[PDB]
Every structure is written in C-alpha cells, then in structure tokens.
Structure 1
Amino acid sequence: RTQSYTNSFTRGVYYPDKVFRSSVLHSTQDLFLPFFSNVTWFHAIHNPALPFNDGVYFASTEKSNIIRGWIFGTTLDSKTQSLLIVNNATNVVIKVCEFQFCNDPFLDVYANNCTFEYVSQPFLMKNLREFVFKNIDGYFKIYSKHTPINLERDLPQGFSALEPLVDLPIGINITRFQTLLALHAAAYYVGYLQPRTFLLKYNENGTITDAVDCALDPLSETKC
C-alpha cells in the first residue's frame, strides 16, 4: 500500500473523564495525540499489519461504506495467547480465531475456547463523511470512541470533541493492528498517541472548544 505522510493538524482532542465541567480551564495528563505529528496516509489497494503502540488514532474519510472493522490482537496466527478482537460493524466479539477467519481478510459478500461472547449495538452510528476513532487499551478496559464532523479535508483546520462510545472491559496485550476493507481504495489515516499534558477549555455547554499541548513550543509551556 502507498505510504504517504501528513501532519495531524491539531486534531484528536478527546474527553478524559465522565464528568461534566463548564467554563473551567482544566489541565489533564492522559494519552493524547501530540499536535502537528506525522500521521500516515495509507492508500489500500494491495499486506502486513500496523503496531498498536499505546493507542492508535484512526481516521477515515470514506463515504461509500467501505470501512468495517479491525483485528486488534497480538499474534493472529494460532495456538498462542491469541485473544484478538474481532471488532466489526455491530459484532464486537473477542473470539480466539486462531487462524484468519473470513478467508484472507477482505469481507467477502457475494474447538479450543468458546468464551467472551460480547455482543453490543451497531458500533458506528450526504456527500462526504469523516470517521474519527481514538482506540486506547489503557487499564484492562479497551476504550473505543468516535465523533462526527461536518467538513472533510486532509485533517482540516478546526477543533472537535469526543463523545465516548463503548467501554469494553476485555482485551489483553494488543500490539498488532489490522483493518478490514469491503471487496465483493480506502485512504485511511493512522496516528499514534503519546503521554502528554493538555490544557482543555470548556464553555457554557459541556464541550471542549480548545486545547493547548503543554510541551510543543515554549509559548505553550508559558500558557500552561
């Protein structure tokens, strides 16, 4: 696949807690995406997998209903730990698949252990639409979280929010990371999170409007 490069452009600020705050300049220390970082612009037409290095910021600008799910796991081959997420559009199941189910992974359309059968709602949800994800492993419970957006560019100028979506309390030692396409051209972005201190700005609503990365440049250190 084609490995292009793009800067992150102050995108990926997320809610760190389940607590309403209003008009408070609260400063948090969580695993965020650093400002102006080289995210990758994988053009999927061709395939080894991606690392999961303390959380993966996933973004995709597809509208034609191509992106489906991911195979967050460790080794994905056989007989090992193999507790791999079989994250899908609605079936977020933690089956040990041993070998690769659904043939080679392209989602064709036209024994050991039988545990952790977690089943939930539709996980995700008229010209363009951008999906933003911030999958962290964290402390035991995997946090997967999604926000919408209106305008679509190559990670455009603006600030967004999080609205956390699921809180699955299962998953052990995820290091490798995959992506499902729809084959009967994806162009998705991948960013890697690092432990940094942020300074979040709320408003009269409960809404993070701005953020300051407290170790980017000395002006931001003065502001923090």
Structure 2
Amino acid sequence: RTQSYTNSFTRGVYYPDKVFRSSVLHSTQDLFLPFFSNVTWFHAIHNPALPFNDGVYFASTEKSNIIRGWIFGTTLDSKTQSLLIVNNATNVVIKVCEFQFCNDPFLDVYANNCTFEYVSQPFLMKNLREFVFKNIDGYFKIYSKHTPINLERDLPQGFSALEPLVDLPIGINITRFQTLLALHAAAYYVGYLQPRTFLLKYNENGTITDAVDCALDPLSETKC
C-alpha cells in the first residue's frame, strides 16, 4: 500500500456514556483520540494486519462503498477463534469463528462450535464516514456518525460527535485488524486511541459542540 501522513484536525470524540445531560460541562476518564495526532492516509493498491492497540479511529471518505467489511483476530491463521464482520448488503453477518482462506482473505464475491451470530440493519448508514472501534471488558463497542463535508483532500476541520449504534458482548482477544478488499483506488483513515481526560461541552440538547484535549498544551490544562 501507500503510506501518506497527515494530522487529526480536531475530531475523534464520541459520547462516553448513554446518559443524557444538557447545558453542563463534564470530564470523562476514557480513551479518546488525541488532538492533532499523527494519522496515516492509507492507499490500498499493493498488506499485513495492523495492530489493535486499545482502539481504532477507522475512517473512510469513499463515496461508492468500496470499503465494506472488517476482520479481527489474534493470530488470524486458522489457529485462534478470531472474529469476522461481514456487511452483506442490507444486513450484517458476524461470526465469532473463522474460515481463513489466506492472510488477506479476498472473499470470492464475483465451524468447530461457533458461539454467537448476529443479523441487523445495514451497517453503513461530501462524505466522511467515521467508525471508532474499541474492546473493553470483552465488549466490542461501535461508534458511527454520518458527516456531510465539502473538502475531499484530507481530514476536514470543525467539530462533530459520534453516536453509538451496535453493541457486541463477544470478541475475547483481538490484537490485529484488516479492512476488506473484495473486488467485484481506495483510501481509509486509521488512528490509534490512548487514555485521555477530555472535558466535554454540552449545548441545550445532548450534543457535544466543543471539547478540549486536556494534555495538548498548558492553556487546555488551565481550562481543565
């Protein structure tokens, strides 16, 4: 692939808890994305599994839905149980077991006591698609936000909040991940989460309008 490098540009926040609040300022000890961090503009044309360190910011600007599915696992060589996420058209297929064609699966779109399966609404929903993934206490949290934009060169500036959609209770051990490249170029943004102490501003509704990265600079420490 191609490794172009850019910046975070003041985004990567989400609602930490499913509790409503309004016109209040709240501080959460959580695992947000740092402000103005070092994200990679991956161009998938020529791909080993990237590590899963405490969370993935994963984003895509693809209009035509080239990026469809995801795989997770520890070894991902038909040796561990791993994980499989399939966005089969207007459905989601989740398998806790594996099939493991080879290292990069390339499913041809042209199992030893499986535990959990799932089916739901379609997973996907001038476009900036954002999925924050994390795995805490064996629970695979999924965040999403549809972001109409006007800039198609890098990560646009501004502020937006990511809402939770689907919660999973399984996954056990995940330390690798890889996007889907099934053919029937491409661009996916990825960032790494770290524990932070963000302070959030709520409007008259429960909408996160602004936030501060509490260890970015001493002015934000004063604001904290």
Q: Distance in 2 between matches of 1:29 and 1:176?
A: 25
Distance 1:146 1:138, change over 3 A: farther
Distance 1:147 1:203, change over 3 A: same
Where 1:220 maps in the other structure, the secondary structure is helix
Count of aligned positions: 224
After superposition, the C-alpha distances for 1:165-219 in whole angstroms (9 at most, x for unaligned) are 1111111111000100241221111000000000111111220000001111111
The Cα shift of 1:80 comes to 2.8
Pairwise CA RMSD: 3.0
After superposition, the C-alpha distances for 1:71-106 in whole angstroms (9 at most, x for unaligned) are 022111123343555566655444354442599533
After superposition, the C-alpha distances for 1:3-60 in whole angstroms (9 at most, x for unaligned) are 1111111111111011111111111111000001101111001110111100000111
Q: Distance in 2 between matches of 1:137 and 1:90?
A: 29
Distance 1:89 1:25, change over 3 A: farther
CA contact (8 A) 1:71 1:177 kept: yes
Distance 1:96 1:167, change over 3 A: closer
Q: Distance in 1 between matches of 2:98 and 2:70?
A: 16
Distance 1:25 1:141, change over 3 A: closer
CA contact (8 A) 2:144 2:165 kept: yes
CA contact (8 A) 1:74 1:82 kept: yes
CA contact (8 A) 1:58 1:133 kept: yes
Distance 1:63 1:14, change over 3 A: same
Task: Tell me whether 120-129 or 171-180 shows the greater mean CA deviation.
Answer: 120-129
The percentage of aligned residue pairs carrying the same residue is 100
Q: Distance in 2 between matches of 1:138 and 1:97?
A: 16
CA contact (8 A) 1:74 1:173 kept: yes
TM-score normalised to the size of structure 2? 0.85
Are residue 89 (structure 1) and residue 94 (structure 2) matched?
no
The Cα shift of 1:126 comes to 7.1
Where 1:31 maps in the other structure, the secondary structure is coil
Structure with greater strand share of residues:
2
Distance 1:57 1:126, change over 3 A: closer
Q: Distance in 1 between matches of 2:142 and 2:172?
A: 9
After superposition, the C-alpha distances for 1:138-172 in whole angstroms (9 at most, x for unaligned) are 75666677766565441111000112111111111
The Cα shift of 1:117 comes to 1.4
Q: Distance in 2 between matches of 1:128 and 1:143?
A: 14
Q: Distance in 2 between matches of 1:113 and 1:208?
A: 43
CA contact (8 A) 2:12 2:57 kept: yes
CA contact (8 A) 2:73 2:80 kept: no
CA contact (8 A) 2:134 2:141 kept: no
Q: Which runs of 5 or more structure 2 residues have no equivalent in the other structure?
A: none
Distance 1:128 1:47, change over 3 A: closer
TM-score normalised to the size of structure 1? 0.85
The Cα shift of 1:124 comes to 1.4
CA contact (8 A) 1:68 1:89 kept: no
Distance 1:106 1:70, change over 3 A: same
